[PDB]
Amino acid sequence: IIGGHEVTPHSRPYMASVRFGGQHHCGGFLLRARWVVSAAHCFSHRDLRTGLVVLGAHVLSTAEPTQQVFGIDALTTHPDYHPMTHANDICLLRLNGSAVLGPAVGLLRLPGRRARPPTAGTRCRVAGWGFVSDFEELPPGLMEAKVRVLDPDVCNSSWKGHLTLTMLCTRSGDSHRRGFCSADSGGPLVCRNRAHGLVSFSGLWCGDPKTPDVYTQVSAFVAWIWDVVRRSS
Ligand SMILES: *[C@@H]1O[C@H](CO)[C@@H](O[C@@H]2O[C@H](CO)[C@@H](O)[C@H](O)[C@H]2NC(C)=O)[C@H](O)[C@H]1NC(C)=O
Ligand SMILES: *C[C@@](*)(O)[C@H](CCCCN)NC(=O)[C@H](CC(C)C)NC(=O)[C@H](N)C(C)C
Ligand SMILES: *[C@@H]1O[C@H](CO)[C@@H](O)[C@H](O)[C@H]1NC(C)=O
């Protein structure tokens, strides 16, 4: 996360750390005790059994008592996720067990089915354990940045018309570079206490205004998410 601050340890309990080969790879969120929502691209060319979902963490490197580590029993990627286009960059993860709810391991709510994406200007927040700059610099723990929803017609121009109706953008509330970076994918864009977006792609350099931060418009997927969840009891 660029242009962000470190969060109060355990102040965002829904945050999941998807890790492959010891190293933290992506972000995600706890939907239900057994379910985690993430970016479909995180699992591309990975063997699931090399992966763990870590909940209740702040300093990922430290083995905290608050931490709860689970395996991926099953991964449901959006059937229509397209590499090259990056559309439908969403997936669901069924853990090998249910997470024990506590003050450090908690749920995040999706918008209703009756939901349009947040308006251009809306104050939103993006958390993650990914890089803090374009120099591979690591955060001291879970970081968050305060962002504001950017007009899609504006975002689509910057992106040379590569944006689909199921994507949504952010921009910093000021002149500084604020947003997501590498290893922040899958993590949620919280708007009005609901997961409105999910960290998908950005340009080359982090928070660069010329290439605004693109997210998956969660509301457009709510129906699918539940379908999958009720499918697997
Ligand atoms: C859930 O999945 C994980 C990953 O497949 C299981 O793996 C254990 O994880 C620890 C480290 O976290 C390893 O040292 C053990 O060797 C792994 N055990 C097994 C059985 O592979 C984890 O055990 C699973 N938990 C449950 C309750 O099934
Ligand atoms: C997957 C996630 O870790 C990143 C987060 C954005 C960091 C960008 N500074 N997303 C990507 O790496 C996606 C790739 C997926 C195929 C959508 N791609 C991009 O961000 C860009 N097009 C370039 C960084 C390659
Ligand atoms: C973005 O622009 C292209 C080309 O003008 C258009 O086909 C597409 O529907 C637009 N998408 C959005 C999200 O506005």
Side-chain angles (χ1 to χ4, degrees):
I1 300 282
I2 192 143
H5 295 265
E6 188 183 352
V7 306
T8 292
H10 314 100
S11 54
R12 310 294 187 260
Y14 49 81
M15 288 304 304
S17 179
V18 173
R19 62 190 221 164
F20 285 109
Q23 224 162 298
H24 153 86
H25 191 63
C26 268
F29 77 87
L30 195 69
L31 184 80
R32 184 60 236 184
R34 270 259 196 160
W35 300 94
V36 167
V37 180
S38 201
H41 81 254
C42 300
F43 306 90
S44 288
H45 309 109
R46 297 269 163 193
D47 198 328
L48 278 178
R49 296 181 196 185
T50 330
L52 309 158
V53 181
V54 178
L55 305 151
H58 186 82
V59 184
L60 249 45
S61 86
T62 287
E64 282 125 52
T66 34
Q67 297 196 33
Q68 288 199 57
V69 175
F70 296 88
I72 300 126
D73 232 335
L75 148 89
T76 313
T77 276
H78 192 278
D80 313 302
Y81 170 61
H82 191 283
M84 287 180 280
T85 246
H86 330 284
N88 317 296
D89 192 354
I90 190 145
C91 69
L92 273 138
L93 302 155
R94 187 185 69 223
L95 318 181
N96 58 0
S98 294
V100 170
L101 164 90
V105 182
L107 303 193
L108 180 72
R109 276 206 57 213
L110 298 179
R113 296 152 161 273
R114 60 190 277 246
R116 32 223 109 86
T119 48
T122 306
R123 277 179 190 152
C124 300
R125 64 197 207 265
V126 56
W129 290 276
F131 307 107
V132 291
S133 67
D134 293 318
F135 305 102
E136 296 68 47
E137 306 176 277
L138 282 176
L142 189 72
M143 305 274 296
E144 194 175 75
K146 302 181 290 260
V147 293
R148 282 171 170 271
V149 172
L150 172 91
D151 190 279
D153 306 351
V154 168
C155 190
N156 206 16
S157 328
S158 287
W159 277 98
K160 301 180 175 54
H162 293 83
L163 247 92
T164 76
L165 299 146
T166 57
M167 299 172 185
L168 98 110
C169 311
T170 64
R171 58 137 198 146
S172 166
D174 56 48
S175 59
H176 294 117
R177 280 175 181 198
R178 314 187 182 277
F180 62 73
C181 216
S182 314
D184 284 329
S185 309
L189 174 73
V190 183
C191 306
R192 301 183 199 100
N193 305 300
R194 305 285 194 271
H196 271 93
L198 215 75
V199 177
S200 172
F201 65 97
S202 148
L204 177 60
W205 313 117
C206 296
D208 167 37
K210 296 214 127 77
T211 58
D213 278 355
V214 192
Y215 298 75
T216 286
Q217 189 201 282
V218 175
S219 89
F221 298 90
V222 170
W224 174 75
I225 296 164
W226 295 126
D227 195 55
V228 176
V229 171
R230 86 172 143 181
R231 258 156 40 175
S232 321
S233 193

